[PDB]
């Protein structure tokens, strides 16, 4: 295993976005993972669509908070479209899958990596974007601005974020997470959360539930 990985330098991830008012973490992190295996697989970098899922995968409650897993097995029957040709709106309207166009992207699969653990996570970051979770309830988390983050924060997580890679700041160890709170909120809407080592529910509950999709 590398000393240090991050997705974004290896093109495979896309610009920092903003959910707004809507609960939709959880589709903005399953899209974020699907964009970084297609580039992976096919070379090419292709923005994909969160309100497809929002309107669409129903197990999930669209702006009222939802469901990483749901969302990858959604990608995986079904595929997914072009963010031009179905976007974004911050609301959960009629699912339109099939009167938009454009290519799918879709993908063969989704993997659980067992959680509470430092090295499964690595692990499954070595290889890919990973759907993470985390709890952003408290003023240190909505306030950050920078460095290695290290709460106060419980492990109560409602929050779904995207690790792109993982690394250490002299003598730190952190993992590289982009958030959807737009560019204006952490490092340029990345955080870097500090690694709690071994078995362990994470800082802030990061270990707690991990999934990523996979591609042939
Ligand atoms: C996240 C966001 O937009 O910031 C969004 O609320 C969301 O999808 N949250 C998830 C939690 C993460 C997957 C950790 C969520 O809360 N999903 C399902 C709601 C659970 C409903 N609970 C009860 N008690 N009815």
């Known amino acids: 295993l590398p000393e240090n990985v991050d997705w974004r330098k290896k093109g495979a991830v896309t610009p920092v976005r903003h959910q707004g008012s809507c609960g939709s973490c959880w589709a903005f992190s399953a899209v974020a993972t699907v964009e970084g295996i ?9 923005e994909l669509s969160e309100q497809e899922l929002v309107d669409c995968e129903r197990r999930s409650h669209g702006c009222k908070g939802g469901y990483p897993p749901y969302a990858l097995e959604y990608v995986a029957k079904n595929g997914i479209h072009l963010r031009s040709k179905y976007p974004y709106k911050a609301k959960q309207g009629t699912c339109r899958a099939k ?3 454009g290519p799918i992207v879709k993908t063969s699969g989704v993997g659980r990596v067992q ?7 690595l692990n499954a970051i070595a290889k890919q974007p990973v759907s993470v979770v985390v709890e952003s309830k408290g003023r240190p988390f909505q306030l950050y601005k920078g460095g290695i ?6 492990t109560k997580v409602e ?15 952190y ?4 958030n959807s709170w737009g560019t204006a909120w952490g490092e340029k809407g990345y955080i870097r959360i500090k690694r709690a080592p071994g078995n362990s529910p994470g800082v802030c509950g990061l270990y707690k539930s991990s999934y990523y999709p996979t591609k042939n």
């Not at 297609?38 to 292709?46: A, E, M, P, S």
């Not at 983050?149 to 419980?154: A, H, M, R, V």
């Open 38 to 46: 297609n580039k992976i697989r096919t070379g090419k970098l292709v």
């Open 99 to 101: 009167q938009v166009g």
């Open 115 to 121: 959680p509470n653990n430092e090295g499964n996570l």
């Open 149 to 154: 983050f290290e709460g106060p924060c419980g």
């Open 159 to 173: 929050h779904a974020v995207t690790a792109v890679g993982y690394g250490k700041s002299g003598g730190k160890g």
């Open 175 to 178: 993992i590289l997470i982009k």
